[PDB]
Structure formats: C-alpha cells, structure tokens
Amino acid sequence: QELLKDYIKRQIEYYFSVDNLERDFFLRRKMDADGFLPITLIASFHRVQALTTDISLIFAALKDSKVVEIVDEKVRRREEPEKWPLPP
C-alpha cells in the first residue's frame, strides 16, 4: 500500500497548502479555532475517496507528513494553523 499511501498523503497535503487555503472557504469554515478538522471529513472528499475508503491508510499516510499534524481524530496544518479558520 506504499504507493497508494503516497498518493493519499500528497492529495491531503494539497488541501492544507497555502495556495489552496487562500480560496478554500468550506475547509476553513469547518476548522475549529485551532485549525483542526476531522480526518473523517477529509476522507469524504472526492479525490481521497477515489483512492481509498480505508481510514487506517489515511491515518498512516498523514503520520508521514511534514505539512500536517494529527491529534486523535483531527488534523491541521502545522505552520500557523490559527490564521486560517473562518466563521461557520
């Protein structure tokens, strides 16, 4: 599953990129004030669900990332996550 994990990792890192975040008003509305989102919400996005429905592989893919941080069931951008949340 190593190649599939790499595709999932890079797809989710795109969502958490600055270039995406500047326009991704839905993602930012769903963040809590600390920048965290449910990993299961990310799992529902079309390009992730195309690759897998195995939540364990999604967690494994993201543990490897230098872009995002996992706390329990939630994920956020590591760099300055508090700048991005928006009102629901």
Added chain:
RNA sequence: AAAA
C-alpha cells in the same frame, strides 16, 4: 467539492 472548479483538487471542498
């Protein structure tokens, strides 16, 4: 879901 214009890579939510």
